[PDB]
């Protein structure tokens, strides 16, 4: 059969220009009489159509998108690319390249939606601190004890403990954005009080835009 | 200005049979083709009906779709309702060379609740040695997910530089949230002690933390 395949960094800058390419494989753009269109699906929204594409240079817009998508198609590589200018923080959607036939019909294979997301100030490293676990941090035989991942740009983060080790009683939790545009989150396990000064905890937070991995072993307060 | 009108949530028990509508403002739906998308959380949609009443291969047949062009409503027919039905359908058209989508319908069919067990950590001496200090509240283990945190300083409640997370399901079916409170080393130390309070079903769980 054929398939649809969509590359292009997911993050832009605001008031920049966008460039993601959708790429096809298994067929041809110019035969079949094929359409080629866009649609974007902001999370927790409905679908929103940008616009749609033919071989040749017949082209059509949405209006509320008019004059600020820019679709081209390159035969020779047998891929076709969408361009959009003036591009702002309401942007944000899963963008989907959509192989259709008929005009008025359907898009009948779709290709997997890349994640778009209007990039504040600058990729920057995660800020990792240690959860040291206390008396008062836990509430019976068990003790919570965790990594708190803070200051960082853009997402995702990637936390393990002990390489992996421990996947029981971990629990990683959404990103939410802070006060000035950077992000913030934690992973913590449940562990028994009794293997508290007996086994060591590392957490492992990696952040691949940035090339950062920062191991931060997790110790119980030491009072000072 | 034509605009497809679809239920943003729609809920009935499995087995039963389902009518989802989509409306039209200005265009008539017999103007046009209607197309019905069924899509995943977290996948590319599918169509799952298209020619407004002829079925793809590949779907089952309970998957119908009528068209009322005398109310300028498009329905959608589902009947048997299972598991993997739970989507989000959204219906397409065409106007004149403007493809207009739907709304987008939540298809919809119920767990124990459970106690929000909650932890309290310091900031850390690394965190102070890099001039920042951030308090973290997290709360696990209960149902249903609707939460409300409220930081205390001593007595006094805190508000500037409070982060709090949306409840999430876990692996045991349970909810998880998280509360940051961002704040200064100085600050840190001014008051005796912080405490996060967390507030489910009524019932209110407290613990505190101080500078030792």
């Known amino acids: 059969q054929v398939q649809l395949q969509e590359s292009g960094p997911g993050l832009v800058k605001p008031s920049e220009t966008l460039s993601l390419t959708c790429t096809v494989s298994?067929?041809?753009?110019?035969?079949?009489?094929?359409?080629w269109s866009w649609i974007r699906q902001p999370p927790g929204k409905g679908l929103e159509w940008i616009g749609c594409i033919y071989y040749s240079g017949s082209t059509n817009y949405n209006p509320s998108l008019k004059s600020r998508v820019t679709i081209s198609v390159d035969t020779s590589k047998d891929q076709f690319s969408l361009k959009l200018s003036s591009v702002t923080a309401a942007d944000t959607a899963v963008y989907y390249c959509?192989?259709?036939?008929?005009?008025?019909?359907?898009?009948?294979?779709w290709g997997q939606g890349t994640l778009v997301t209007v990039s504040s100030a600058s990729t920057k490293g995660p800020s990792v601190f240690p959860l040291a676990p206390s008396s008062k941090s836990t509430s019976g035989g068990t003790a919570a004890l965790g990594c708190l991942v803070k200051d960082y740009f853009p997402e995702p983060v990637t936390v393990s403990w002990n390489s992996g080790a421990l996947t029981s009683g971990v629990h990683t939790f959404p990103a939410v954005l802070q006060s000035s545009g950077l992000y913030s989150l934690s992973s913590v396990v449940t562990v028994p009080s009794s293997s508290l000064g007996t086994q060591t905890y590392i957490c492992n937070v990696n952040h691949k835009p940035s090339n950062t991995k920062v191991d931060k072993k997790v110790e119980p307060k030491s009072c000072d | 200005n034509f605009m497809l009108t679809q239920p943003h949530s729609v809920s009935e028990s499995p087995g039963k049979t389902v009518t989802i509508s989509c409306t039209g403002s200005?265009?008539?739906?017999?103007?046009?083709?209607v197309q019905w998308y069924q899509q995943r959380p977290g996948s590319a949609p599918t169509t799952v009906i298209y020619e407004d009443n002829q079925r793809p291969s590949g779907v089952p047949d309970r998957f119908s779709g009528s068209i009322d062009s005398s109310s300028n409503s498009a329905s959608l027919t589902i009947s048997g309702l299972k598991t993997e039905d739970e989507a989000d359908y959204y219906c397409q058209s065409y106007d004149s060379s403007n493809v207009v989508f739907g709304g987008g319908t939540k298809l919809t069919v119920g767990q124990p609740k459970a106690a929000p067990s909650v932890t309290l950590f310091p900031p850390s001496s690394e965190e102070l040695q890099a001039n920042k200090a951030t308090l973290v509240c997290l709360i696990s283990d209960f149902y249903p997910g609707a939460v409300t945190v409220a930081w205390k300083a001593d007595s006094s409640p805190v508000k500037a530089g409070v982060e709090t997370t949306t409840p999430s399901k876990q692996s045991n079916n349970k909810y998880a949230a998280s509360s940051y409170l961002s704040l200064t080393p100085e600050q840190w130390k001014s008051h005796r002690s912080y405490s996060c309070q967390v507030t489910h079903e009524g019932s209110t769980v407290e613990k505190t933390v101080a500078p030792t």
């Open positions: 298994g067929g041809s753009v110019s035969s079949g009489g094929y359409f």
């Open positions: 959509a192989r259709q036939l008929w005009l008025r019909g359907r898009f009948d294979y």
């Open positions: 200005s265009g008539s739906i017999a103007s046009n083709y």
